[PDB]
Amino acid sequence: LPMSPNHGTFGGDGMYSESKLSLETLFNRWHSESWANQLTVCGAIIGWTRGTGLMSANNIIAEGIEKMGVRTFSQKEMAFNLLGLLTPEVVELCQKSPVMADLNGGLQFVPELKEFTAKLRKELVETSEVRKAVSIETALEHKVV
């Protein structure tokens, strides 16, 4: 199950959080209902993965985040983490009881992450549009003189 640590933390993602949070009932329904012998639940709390269809917009700030001793993942890295869950040890472990893997690279320990993300984007779009403006005005001054 591709779970998330985002439980409405970022907002403006529709029912994404409602979808991901809901998947976590499968950890309990494995014990309660009568399908434990046919399916094993292996939840994978996937962290910030750069270059995907869902998180391509958020790549420029990833360097900013990583300077809090947090870890963003390449797609090869996050794949490798997830292929770790199909190895024989974790497969024998999922058949005893449901397995929750945290592949979140320490991103839960950042307090109030949406602000810290919006603050990183604004310090970067600002420093762009300022330098763009100062450069285009220093060109128009040079060209007049």
Binding site: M68, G69, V70, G106, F109, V110
Partner: peptide, 6 residues
């Protein structure tokens, strides 16, 4: 350093 609990 941020992952260190108490």
């Amino acid at each position: 350093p941020i992952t260190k609990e108490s």
